[PDB]
């Protein structure tokens, strides 16, 4: 088995809309997140990345899933811990690398999201927790994947 590097992903999910960020420098909408750093808990890394990437603060997050990504030709797995929150402080801010935008929950922009999101984001919307794994060739093609609803993440 490959080694894995820890990442976070945060979805700001309100009753009628979700906040996503478009990668500016590519072209896909995603939640907010990045690499966990030395000495911080995963949840604190998720809060930090949300603040660094979007400007938003939150005192707490709910863990909703974990997804492992494998890319053909890359030596490490990405171990992505997925969090949600419904409660925000501040306005999202555009940066040189990210443009935030709200989407109504009948307009989730799946075609401009990573392909895996079509599989797990419906579970998130149903208040379900999940574990996933996806093996990609490049940015567009899934060669293998597993997904399971779990009671505890
Ligand atoms: N297939 C996929 N589907 C998805 O929904 N999110 C993915 C994904 N693959 C990666 N992600 C998420 C995980 C993480 O939040 C983000 C990728 O992290 P980044 O590359 O932004 O890390 P960092 O920006 O911290 O690294 P540096 O650029 O070195 O600072 O995208
Ligand atoms: Na990031």
Curated annotation (Swiss-Prot):
PROSITE patterns: NUDIX (PS51462), NUDIX_BOX (PS00893). 8-oxo-dGTP binds at residues 8, 23, 30, 32-35, 114-117. Optimum pH is 7.8-8.2 with 8-oxo-dGTP as substrate, and 8.0-8.5 with 2-oxo-dATP as substrate. 8-oxo-dGMP binds at residues 8, 23, 30, 114-117. Changing residue 54 to R: Loss of activity. Changing residue 153 to A: Slightly reduces 2-oxo-dATPase and 8-oxo-dGTPase activities and increases thermolability. 8-oxo-ATP binds at residues 32-35, 49, 53, 114-117. Changing residue 52 to G: Loss of activity. O(6)-methyl-dGMP binds at residues 8, 23, 30, 114-117. GO terms for biological process: DNA protection; DNA repair; purine nucleoside catabolic process; response to oxidative stress. It catalyses: 2-oxo-dATP + H2O = 2-oxo-dAMP + diphosphate + H(+); 2-oxo-ATP + H2O = 2-oxo-AMP + diphosphate + H(+); 8-oxo-dGTP + H2O = 8-oxo-dGMP + diphosphate + H(+); 8-oxo-dATP + H2O = 8-oxo-dAMP + diphosphate + H(+). N(6)-methyl-AMP binds at residues 8, 23, 114-117. Widely expressed with highest expression in thymus, testis, embryo and proliferating blood lymphocytes. The N-terminus is blocked. Inhibited by 2-oxo-dADP and 8-oxo-dGDP. 2-oxo-dATP binds at residues 8, 30, 32-35, 114-117. Monomer. Oxidized purine nucleoside triphosphate hydrolase which is a prominent sanitizer of the oxidized nucleotide pool. Catalyzes the hydrolysis of 2-oxo-dATP (2-hydroxy-dATP) into 2-oxo-dAMP. Also has a significant hydrolase activity toward 2-oxo-ATP, 8-oxo-dGTP and 8-oxo-dATP. Through the hydrolysis of oxidized purine nucleoside triphosphates, prevents their incorporation into DNA and the subsequent transversions A:T to C:G and G:C to T:A. Also catalyzes the hydrolysis of methylated purine nucleoside triphosphate preventing their integration into DNA. This is Oxidized purine nucleoside triphosphate hydrolase. The lineage of its organism: Eukaryota, Metazoa, Chordata, Craniata, Vertebrata.
């Amino acid at each position: 088995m490959k080694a894995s590097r820890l990442y976070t992903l945060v979805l700001v999910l309100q009753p009628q809309r979700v906040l996503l960020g478009m990668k500016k420098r590519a072209g896909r909408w995603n939640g907010f997140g990045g690499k966990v750093q030395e000495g911080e808990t995963i949840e604190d890394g998720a809060r930090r990345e949300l603040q660094e990437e979007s400007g938003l603060t939150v005192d707490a997050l709910h863990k909703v899933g974990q997804i492992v990504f494998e890319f053909v030709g890359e030596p490490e797995l990405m171990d992505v811990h997925v969090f949600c929150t419904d409660s925000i402080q501040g306005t999202p801010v555009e940066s040189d690398e990210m443009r935030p935008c709200w989407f109504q929950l009948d307009q989730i922009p799946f075609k401009d999201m990573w392909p895996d999101d079509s599989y797990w984001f419906p579970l998130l919307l149903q208040k379900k927790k999940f574990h996933g794994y996806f093996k990609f060739q490049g940015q567009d093609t899934i060669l293998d994947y597993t997904l399971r609803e779990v009671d505890t993440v």
